[PDB]
Protein backbone atom coordinates (compact mmCIF):
# COMPACT_ATOMS: atom_id res chain seq x y z
CA UNK A 1 0.00 0.00 0.00
CA UNK A 2 3.20 1.98 0.12
CA UNK A 3 3.98 -0.45 -2.74
CA UNK A 4 2.56 -1.35 -6.15
CA UNK A 5 3.30 -4.03 -8.72
CA UNK A 6 4.44 -3.89 -12.34
CA UNK A 7 5.21 -6.93 -14.42
CA UNK A 8 8.51 -6.93 -16.23
CA UNK A 9 8.40 -9.99 -18.38
CA UNK A 10 8.00 -13.03 -16.12
CA UNK A 11 9.14 -11.09 -13.11
CA UNK A 12 7.11 -8.95 -10.76
CA UNK A 13 8.57 -5.72 -9.45
CA UNK A 14 6.99 -4.57 -6.23
CA UNK A 15 8.31 -1.09 -5.51
CA UNK A 16 7.51 2.04 -3.53
CA UNK A 17 4.90 4.33 -5.12
CA UNK A 18 7.57 7.05 -5.47
CA UNK A 19 9.24 4.90 -8.16
CA UNK A 20 7.39 5.35 -11.44
CA UNK A 21 7.79 4.70 -15.18
CA UNK A 22 9.66 1.39 -14.79
CA UNK A 23 11.44 0.12 -17.92
CA UNK A 24 13.78 -2.89 -17.85
CA UNK A 25 17.33 -2.12 -18.96
CA UNK A 26 19.32 -5.05 -17.62
CA UNK A 27 18.98 -8.77 -16.94
CA UNK A 28 21.96 -10.92 -16.03
CA UNK A 29 22.56 -13.56 -13.37
CA UNK A 30 22.82 -10.82 -10.78
CA UNK A 31 19.30 -9.45 -11.48
CA UNK A 32 16.73 -7.38 -13.42
CA UNK A 33 17.32 -3.65 -13.49
CA UNK A 34 14.74 -1.10 -14.46
CA UNK A 35 15.20 2.53 -15.19
CA UNK A 36 12.70 4.63 -13.28
CA UNK A 37 11.74 8.13 -12.28
CA UNK A 38 11.89 8.88 -8.55
CA UNK A 39 9.01 11.24 -7.75
CA UNK A 40 10.42 12.25 -4.35
CA UNK A 41 14.02 13.00 -5.33
CA UNK A 42 12.76 14.33 -8.69
CA UNK A 43 15.35 12.53 -10.78
CA UNK A 44 16.03 9.34 -12.66
CA UNK A 45 17.13 6.17 -10.90
CA UNK A 46 18.07 2.54 -11.67
CA UNK A 47 16.21 -0.09 -9.62
CA UNK A 48 17.77 -3.55 -9.35
CA UNK A 49 15.84 -6.58 -8.08
CA UNK A 50 18.33 -9.12 -6.73
CA UNK A 51 18.33 -12.51 -8.42
CA UNK A 52 17.41 -15.09 -5.80
CA UNK A 53 19.44 -13.74 -2.85
CA UNK A 54 18.75 -16.71 -0.54
CA UNK A 55 18.63 -19.48 -3.15
CA UNK A 56 22.06 -20.49 -1.80
CA UNK A 57 25.12 -19.29 0.12
CA UNK A 58 26.89 -18.17 -3.10
CA UNK A 59 23.99 -15.80 -3.86
CA UNK A 60 23.61 -14.93 -0.16
CA UNK A 61 27.25 -13.81 0.38
CA UNK A 62 27.37 -11.86 -2.90
CA UNK A 63 24.19 -10.03 -2.00
CA UNK A 64 25.57 -9.29 1.47
CA UNK A 65 28.84 -8.03 -0.03
CA UNK A 66 26.92 -5.86 -2.48
CA UNK A 67 24.66 -4.37 0.19
CA UNK A 68 27.41 -3.55 2.74
CA UNK A 69 30.01 -2.22 0.25
CA UNK A 70 27.37 0.02 -1.36
CA UNK A 71 26.36 1.45 2.03
CA UNK A 72 29.86 2.28 3.18
CA UNK A 73 31.57 3.24 -0.06
CA UNK A 74 30.67 6.79 -1.01
CA UNK A 75 32.39 8.82 -3.73
CA UNK A 76 31.14 10.85 -6.70
CA UNK A 77 32.96 8.45 -9.03
CA UNK A 78 31.36 5.26 -7.79
CA UNK A 79 27.76 4.21 -8.23
CA UNK A 80 26.34 4.76 -4.80
CA UNK A 81 23.21 3.53 -3.09
CA UNK A 82 20.25 5.91 -2.99
CA UNK A 83 17.96 3.44 -1.22
CA UNK A 84 17.30 -0.26 -0.51
CA UNK A 85 14.04 -1.92 0.37
CA UNK A 86 11.98 -5.04 0.42
CA UNK A 87 8.23 -5.17 -0.11
CA UNK A 88 7.93 -7.86 2.60
CA UNK A 89 6.93 -6.91 6.16
CA UNK A 90 8.67 -9.53 8.34
CA UNK A 91 11.81 -11.67 8.46
CA UNK A 92 9.66 -14.71 7.78
CA UNK A 93 8.00 -13.25 4.69
CA UNK A 94 11.29 -11.80 3.41
CA UNK A 95 12.11 -12.75 -0.26
CA UNK A 96 13.25 -9.81 -2.44
CA UNK A 97 15.86 -7.02 -2.18
CA UNK A 98 15.57 -3.83 -4.26
CA UNK A 99 18.60 -1.58 -4.63
CA UNK A 100 18.17 1.98 -5.95
CA UNK A 101 21.02 3.82 -7.74
CA UNK A 102 21.41 7.02 -9.77
CA UNK A 103 20.61 6.42 -13.44
CA UNK A 104 23.56 7.19 -15.74
CA UNK A 105 23.11 7.99 -19.41
CA UNK A 106 25.56 5.60 -21.08
CA UNK A 107 28.40 3.18 -20.55
CA UNK A 108 31.81 3.85 -22.14
CA UNK A 109 31.48 1.36 -25.12
CA UNK A 110 30.29 3.78 -27.76
CA UNK A 111 31.68 7.04 -26.26
CA UNK A 112 35.36 5.98 -26.21
CA UNK A 113 35.41 5.28 -29.95
CA UNK A 114 34.18 8.82 -30.71
CA UNK A 115 37.37 10.85 -30.73
CA UNK A 116 37.39 13.00 -27.63
CA UNK A 117 39.76 15.90 -27.22
CA UNK A 118 42.49 15.76 -24.56
CA UNK A 119 40.48 17.79 -22.04
CA UNK A 120 37.68 15.20 -22.00
CA UNK A 121 39.97 12.19 -22.38
CA UNK A 122 42.12 13.28 -19.45
CA UNK A 123 39.12 14.31 -17.36
CA UNK A 124 37.35 10.99 -17.88
CA UNK A 125 40.56 9.17 -16.94
CA UNK A 126 41.11 11.46 -13.94
CA UNK A 127 37.59 10.50 -12.84
CA UNK A 128 38.11 6.71 -13.25
CA UNK A 129 41.32 6.87 -11.23
CA UNK A 130 39.69 8.80 -8.38
CA UNK A 131 37.05 6.07 -8.33
CA UNK A 132 39.57 3.22 -8.44
CA UNK A 133 41.69 4.94 -5.77
CA UNK A 134 38.65 5.13 -3.52
CA UNK A 135 37.73 1.46 -4.14
CA UNK A 136 41.33 0.47 -3.37
CA UNK A 137 41.20 2.45 -0.13
CA UNK A 138 38.20 0.31 0.91
CA UNK A 139 40.23 -2.80 0.21
CA UNK A 140 38.43 -3.51 -3.03
CA UNK A 141 40.48 -4.38 -6.09
CA UNK A 142 38.22 -4.60 -9.10
CA UNK A 143 40.14 -6.75 -11.63
CA UNK A 144 37.45 -6.46 -14.31
CA UNK A 145 37.12 -2.82 -15.46
CA UNK A 146 35.90 -2.43 -19.06
CA UNK A 147 33.84 0.05 -21.09
CA UNK A 148 30.66 -1.75 -20.05
CA UNK A 149 31.07 -1.23 -16.30
CA UNK A 150 32.04 2.42 -16.33
CA UNK A 151 29.14 4.79 -16.75
CA UNK A 152 28.77 8.44 -17.70
CA UNK A 153 26.26 11.30 -17.95
CA UNK A 154 25.84 13.90 -20.70
CA UNK A 155 27.56 16.39 -18.35
CA UNK A 156 30.93 14.51 -18.68
CA UNK A 157 30.70 13.01 -15.17
CA UNK A 158 31.63 9.33 -14.67
CA UNK A 159 31.20 6.53 -12.16
CA UNK A 160 32.39 3.01 -11.74
CA UNK A 161 29.32 0.75 -11.97
CA UNK A 162 30.21 -2.09 -9.58
CA UNK A 163 32.82 -3.75 -7.34
CA UNK A 164 34.28 -6.37 -9.67
CA UNK A 165 35.62 -9.79 -8.74
CA UNK A 166 35.35 -9.61 -22.61
CA UNK A 167 38.94 -10.56 -21.68
CA UNK A 168 40.36 -7.64 -23.70
CA UNK A 169 40.85 -5.33 -20.65
CA UNK A 170 42.14 -8.02 -18.29
CA UNK A 171 45.62 -7.62 -16.82
CA UNK A 172 48.32 -10.15 -17.73
CA UNK A 173 48.29 -11.22 -14.03
CA UNK A 174 44.65 -12.23 -14.39
CA UNK A 175 45.07 -13.82 -17.87
CA UNK A 176 47.84 -16.02 -16.54
CA UNK A 177 47.25 -17.34 -13.05
CA UNK A 178 49.51 -15.05 -11.06
CA UNK A 179 48.76 -13.08 -7.90
CA UNK A 180 47.78 -9.41 -8.32
CA UNK A 181 47.90 -6.14 -6.38
CA UNK A 182 46.27 -2.71 -6.60
CA UNK A 183 47.87 -1.81 -9.93
CA UNK A 184 46.05 -4.65 -11.64
CA UNK A 185 43.39 -2.00 -12.21
CA UNK A 186 45.92 0.34 -13.88
CA UNK A 187 46.13 -2.12 -16.79
CA UNK A 188 42.41 -1.99 -17.49
CA UNK A 189 42.66 1.80 -17.42
CA UNK A 190 45.62 1.52 -19.81
CA UNK A 191 43.64 -0.52 -22.35
CA UNK A 192 40.68 1.83 -22.09
CA UNK A 193 42.85 4.89 -22.65
CA UNK A 194 44.75 3.40 -25.62
CA UNK A 195 41.42 2.53 -27.18
CA UNK A 196 40.15 6.16 -26.83
CA UNK A 197 43.26 7.33 -28.66
CA UNK A 198 43.20 4.63 -31.34
CA UNK A 199 39.51 3.95 -32.06
CA UNK A 200 39.29 0.20 -31.49
CA UNK A 201 40.12 -2.57 -29.01
CA UNK A 202 43.85 -2.59 -28.18
CA UNK A 203 44.23 -6.33 -27.63
CA UNK A 204 41.27 -8.22 -29.20
CA UNK A 205 42.18 -11.81 -28.31
CA UNK A 206 39.82 -14.41 -29.83
CA UNK A 207 40.44 -16.66 -26.73
CA UNK A 208 42.22 -16.78 -23.31
CA UNK A 209 45.47 -17.78 -25.03
CA UNK A 210 45.29 -15.44 -28.06
CA UNK A 211 44.87 -12.58 -25.59
CA UNK A 212 48.47 -13.19 -24.44
CA UNK A 213 49.83 -13.29 -28.00
CA UNK A 214 47.99 -10.11 -28.97
CA UNK A 215 49.60 -8.38 -25.97
CA UNK A 216 53.18 -9.53 -26.66
CA UNK A 217 52.92 -8.86 -30.42
CA UNK A 218 52.61 -5.18 -29.54
CA UNK A 219 54.40 -4.81 -26.23
CA UNK A 220 57.18 -7.33 -26.64
CA UNK A 221 57.97 -10.57 -24.88
CA UNK A 222 58.37 -9.94 -21.15
CA UNK A 223 61.63 -10.56 -19.30
CA UNK A 224 62.88 -13.99 -18.19
CA UNK A 225 62.65 -12.56 -14.65
CA UNK A 226 58.91 -12.25 -15.25
CA UNK A 227 58.78 -15.77 -16.71
CA UNK A 228 60.04 -17.21 -13.43
CA UNK A 229 56.91 -15.93 -11.66
CA UNK A 230 54.63 -18.09 -13.78
CA UNK A 231 53.07 -21.49 -12.92
CA UNK A 232 55.00 -24.37 -14.64
CA UNK A 233 52.27 -25.21 -17.13
CA UNK A 234 51.72 -21.60 -18.30
CA UNK A 235 55.47 -20.95 -18.23
CA UNK A 236 56.26 -23.90 -20.52
CA UNK A 237 53.81 -22.45 -23.07
CA UNK A 238 54.62 -18.73 -22.74
CA UNK A 239 58.38 -19.33 -22.59
CA UNK A 240 58.31 -21.19 -25.91
CA UNK A 241 56.56 -18.68 -28.16
CA UNK A 242 58.66 -16.83 -30.75
CA UNK A 243 60.41 -13.78 -29.21
CA UNK A 244 58.68 -10.42 -29.88
CA UNK A 245 60.53 -7.15 -29.59
CA UNK A 246 57.34 -5.05 -29.36
CA UNK A 247 57.06 -1.54 -30.77
CA UNK A 248 58.07 1.71 -29.01
CA UNK A 249 55.05 3.75 -27.90
CA UNK A 250 55.93 6.50 -30.43
CA UNK A 251 55.12 3.86 -33.07
CA UNK A 252 52.17 2.42 -31.15
CA UNK A 253 50.63 5.89 -30.57
CA UNK A 254 52.02 8.43 -33.12
CA UNK A 255 51.04 12.13 -33.14
CA UNK A 256 48.81 11.14 -36.15
CA UNK A 257 46.15 9.51 -33.91
CA UNK A 258 45.55 12.31 -31.40
CA UNK A 259 43.49 15.51 -31.41
CA UNK A 260 49.75 16.91 -24.88
CA UNK A 261 49.97 13.86 -27.18
CA UNK A 262 53.51 13.40 -25.87
CA UNK A 263 52.15 13.34 -22.27
CA UNK A 264 49.34 10.91 -23.00
CA UNK A 265 51.97 8.64 -24.59
CA UNK A 266 54.33 8.66 -21.59
CA UNK A 267 51.39 7.70 -19.39
CA UNK A 268 50.27 4.87 -21.64
CA UNK A 269 53.84 3.49 -21.78
CA UNK A 270 53.66 3.33 -17.96
CA UNK A 271 50.18 1.67 -17.64
CA UNK A 272 50.48 -0.97 -20.34
CA UNK A 273 53.51 -2.65 -18.82
CA UNK A 274 53.10 -6.44 -18.65
CA UNK A 275 55.14 -6.98 -15.48
CA UNK A 276 53.04 -5.41 -12.70
CA UNK A 277 56.09 -4.78 -10.51
CA UNK A 278 57.15 -2.24 -13.14
CA UNK A 279 53.67 -0.87 -13.89
CA UNK A 280 52.72 2.62 -12.63
CA UNK A 281 50.58 2.95 -9.46
CA UNK A 282 47.19 4.66 -9.14
CA UNK A 283 48.76 7.48 -7.06
CA UNK A 284 51.60 7.99 -9.57
CA UNK A 285 49.04 8.01 -12.44
CA UNK A 286 47.01 10.65 -10.55
CA UNK A 287 50.15 12.77 -10.26
CA UNK A 288 50.98 12.35 -13.91
CA UNK A 289 51.03 15.70 -15.84
CA UNK A 290 48.34 14.38 -18.25
CA UNK A 291 45.99 13.64 -15.32
CA UNK A 292 47.19 16.19 -12.71
CA UNK A 293 45.54 19.09 -14.56
CA UNK A 294 42.25 18.28 -12.80
CA UNK A 295 43.68 17.50 -9.36
CA UNK A 296 41.34 18.15 -6.45
CA UNK A 297 42.35 16.71 -3.03
CA UNK A 298 38.67 16.25 -2.04
CA UNK A 299 38.33 13.95 -5.09
CA UNK A 300 41.71 12.21 -5.25
CA UNK A 301 42.36 11.74 -1.49
CA UNK A 302 39.02 11.09 0.39
CA UNK A 303 38.48 8.77 3.49
CA UNK A 304 37.57 4.99 3.47
CA UNK A 305 32.89 -15.62 6.32
CA UNK A 306 30.97 -18.60 7.79
CA UNK A 307 27.14 -18.47 7.93
CA UNK A 308 24.03 -20.54 7.08
CA UNK A 309 21.16 -19.45 4.76
CA UNK A 310 18.86 -18.46 7.63
CA UNK A 311 21.70 -16.42 9.16
CA UNK A 312 22.47 -14.78 5.80
CA UNK A 313 18.73 -14.08 5.37
CA UNK A 314 18.71 -12.21 8.69
CA UNK A 315 22.03 -10.47 8.07
CA UNK A 316 20.66 -9.22 4.73
CA UNK A 317 17.26 -8.35 6.23
CA UNK A 318 18.91 -6.15 8.84
CA UNK A 319 21.01 -4.43 6.16
CA UNK A 320 17.83 -3.65 4.22
CA UNK A 321 16.41 -2.29 7.50
Amino acid sequence: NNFYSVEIGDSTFTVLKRYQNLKPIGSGAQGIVCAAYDAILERNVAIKKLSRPFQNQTHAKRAYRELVLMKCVNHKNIIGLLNVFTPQKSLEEFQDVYIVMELMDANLCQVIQMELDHERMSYLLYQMLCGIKHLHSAGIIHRDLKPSNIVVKSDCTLKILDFGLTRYYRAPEVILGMGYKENVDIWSVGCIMGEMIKGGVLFPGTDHIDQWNKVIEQLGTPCPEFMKKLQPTVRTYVENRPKYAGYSFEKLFPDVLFPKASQARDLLSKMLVIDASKRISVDEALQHPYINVWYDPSEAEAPPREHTIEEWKELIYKEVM
Binding site: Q110, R120, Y123, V152, S154, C156, W294
Partner: peptide, 9 residues
Protein backbone atom coordinates in the same frame (compact mmCIF):
# COMPACT_ATOMS: atom_id res chain seq x y z
CA UNK B 1 41.94 24.59 -17.11
CA UNK B 2 38.15 24.47 -17.28
CA UNK B 3 36.48 21.16 -16.47
CA UNK B 4 34.44 19.99 -19.49
CA UNK B 5 30.74 20.09 -18.68
CA UNK B 6 29.33 18.48 -21.85
CA UNK B 7 29.71 15.01 -23.31
CA UNK B 8 28.12 13.83 -26.57
CA UNK B 9 26.25 10.55 -26.13
Amino acid sequence: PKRPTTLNL
